[PDB]
Design a protein around this ligand. Structure first.
Ligand SMILES: OC[C@H]1O[C@@](CO)(O[C@H]2O[C@H](CO)[C@@H](O)[C@H](O)[C@H]2O)[C@@H](O)[C@@H]1O
Ligand SMILES: OC[C@H]1O[C@@](CO)(O[C@H]2O[C@H](CO)[C@@H](O)[C@H](O)[C@H]2O)[C@@H](O)[C@@H]1O
Ligand SMILES: OC[C@H]1O[C@@](CO)(O[C@H]2O[C@H](CO)[C@@H](O)[C@H](O)[C@H]2O)[C@@H](O)[C@@H]1O
Ligand SMILES: OC[C@H]1O[C@@](CO)(O[C@H]2O[C@H](CO)[C@@H](O)[C@H](O)[C@H]2O)[C@@H](O)[C@@H]1O
Ligand SMILES: OC[C@H]1O[C@@](CO)(O[C@H]2O[C@H](CO)[C@@H](O)[C@H](O)[C@H]2O)[C@@H](O)[C@@H]1O
Ligand SMILES: OC[C@H]1O[C@@](CO)(O[C@H]2O[C@H](CO)[C@@H](O)[C@H](O)[C@H]2O)[C@@H](O)[C@@H]1O
Lengths: 289, 289
């Protein structure tokens, strides 16, 4: 059994053949096509060249599990408005799709197959997330389960002041860009410069970690997960992870109200997390998990 | 089949015989006893006088479903630190207990047996809650599921600024008490006086509803329930319910970020909500639901 596993994003399309244990057997990618018709022909070319038992996909936007339709909006607009169950029917394979942040959450089941209740917070330009409840994805009435970036941790005012706005890597970058006066920054450089003495980076980091810690304690007391995994590029840096944990410890010690602290850990995967999670989504929906 | 149903609180102990459809067949109460030994003898007297098939209980504090022990702290301290499975073993009946705010959430299943995913926010002196996920109570790793009163909607500072502090009936009362200069207030009087022209009451109400609306949109975007039910004494007033909904509509219209609005409704029950919910908890744990 091989699963044709597909990650569609603005940054490119990946196609990989995975085993049911989650081993990548081969991996290829192209630049995002200009039109649906060029993507379907690429996908036809990849699918045609092994005997696949299933097609699993990580996509941006909100999937309707009943129709195969991806709603909402994303960086790849031509993927929306039709049934992928129909678009791929001719392979006569079971097809499942799932939203990318949910995929990242499910990839943790491969790494930690004993997880029952878990939250995953994917930190990028904004903040997306996922919930697992008794070993399964929790999607919610309107597929909005685990949209932790919508959480307002300040009173809305001129701006919504949702978590994505206050606590994301993109918004830490946007803040150092505004005060440094130039745009040659990313999260990883902010870290090097703070380590080198750079005061404004030190402070960008402290605000970031403190806003994350406030929002992570909310998640802990609202859904009470066994663990919260942090994903996205920045969670791949152990200095970020240690800084967030210390920031959480500091809230807990300061407010007598707090008893339990969340268990926090970096996501296991990142670069291929959507492949692994789209795989694990396929296996669960087909009940081979 | 009759279930001996018990609600233990600081305000008194209720004992009622319920049918499995949720009909109260008889209902009695006493003042909270001064000691465990007087409560167990009262309970023995009530239990002795019909043929019960089960014992269902609503209790304050955190229940350990495996041990029957109620942890934490409450207004009735002598109920903590022992197994109620042991304390009641001699009746040789199935015994289940559940925390009171969770009970209130489960009472909604009696009123609305089709609920799959639901949040319940119990508004009193503070804010407690419950989550239902696929028709069952979600308790979480540390029985903290649905402790929505712990959610911080402002940055912590001198005070934690958790939802219970900013949005509860008790804290609306505490605010009118502080500015009116006297203590002859409750939520229901605040409403009459605001209706009569009283400006400070009008404002207490507006702050209350606006803080509730902010926190209710968080719940909607974080767990994405089909409905949020509001319980506690104040939710029994239709003017409060209408004011909260309008306050939510006003956030939605103001922030382009918001698409879906929560469906909000008053809890069906209040005065006997713990009895009904403790009943429904019993039936689910015994798989007769
Ligand atoms: O998993 C979707 C996938 O399965 C196929 C057949 O292998 O279609 C089946 O599933 C669809 C979704 O419910 C049905 O509408 C269809 O009629 C059924 O045969 C493929 O056509 C499709 O890509
Ligand atoms: O943690 C994985 C999570 O992050 C994203 C966005 O960063 O990963 C995508 O973009 C990356 C570019 O930095 C790639 O390395 C990665 O392979 C790609 O999927 C989300 O798409 C993903 O859900
Ligand atoms: O690899 C670390 C680092 O590089 C980034 C830069 O955007 O992503 C690149 O490398 C990934 C491998 O980790 C690829 O999947 C991706 O396509 C590539 O752009 C970061 O996301 C990551 O932090
Ligand atoms: O539901 C608890 C209740 O059941 C009884 C027997 O009717 O005890 C059973 O359940 C306990 C909880 O697991 C066991 O420890 C016990 O050994 C078993 O017989 C009552 O004793 C108890 O109140
Ligand atoms: O909505 C029910 C919820 O409210 C409480 C606290 O108000 O109800 C208890 O106290 C009331 C006094 O106003 C009583 O009317 C009610 O019968 C009693 O249980 C919580 O205990 C309950 O969970
Ligand atoms: O009944 C409405 C109103 O009265 C209060 C006052 O505290 O509770 C009393 O009445 C209840 C019946 O609704 C009883 O269960 C309770 O014991 C009694 O004190 C409020 O809770 C409620 O809003």
């Amino acid at each position: 059994m091989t699963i044709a596993t597909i990650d569609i994003g603005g940054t490119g399309i990946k196609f990989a053949s995975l085993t049911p244990d989650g081993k990548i057997l081969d991996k290829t990618s192209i630049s995002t096509p200009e039109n649906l018709e060029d993507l379907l022909a690429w996908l036809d070319q990849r699918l045609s060249e092994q005997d696949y038992s299933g097609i699993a996909m990580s996509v941006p936007g909100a999937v309707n599990q009943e129709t195969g339709v991806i709603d909402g909006f994303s960086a790849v607009p031509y993927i929306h408005g039709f049934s992928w169950y129909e678009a791929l029917s001719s392979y006569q394979l079971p097809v499942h799709l799932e939203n990318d942040a949910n995929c990242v959450g499910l990839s943790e089941l491969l790494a930690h197959p004993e997880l029952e209740n878990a939250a995953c917070v994917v930190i990028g330009t904004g903040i997306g997330g996922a919930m697992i409840i008794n070993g399964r994805l929790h999607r919610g009435r309107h597929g909005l389960g685990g949209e932790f970036g919508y959480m307002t941790t300040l009173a809305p005012a001129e701006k919504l002041n949702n978590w994505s706005q206050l606590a994301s890597t993109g918004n830490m970058v946007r803040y150092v860009i505004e005060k440094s006066g130039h745009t040659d920054w990313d999260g990883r450089k902010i870290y090097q410069e703070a380590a080198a003495g750079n005061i404004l980076c030190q402070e960008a980091i402290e605000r970031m970690n403190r806003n994350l810690a406030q929002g992570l304690l909310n998640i802990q007391y609202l859904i009470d997960p066994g663990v919260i995994s942090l994903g996205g590029s920045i969670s791949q840096n152990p200095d970020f992870i240690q800084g967030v944990k210390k920031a959480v410890e500091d809230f807990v010690d300061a407010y007598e109200e707090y008893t339990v602290a969340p268990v926090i850990q970096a996501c296991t995967y990142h670069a291929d997390a959507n492949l692994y999670g789209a795989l694990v989504n396929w296996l669960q929906e087909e009940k081979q998990w």
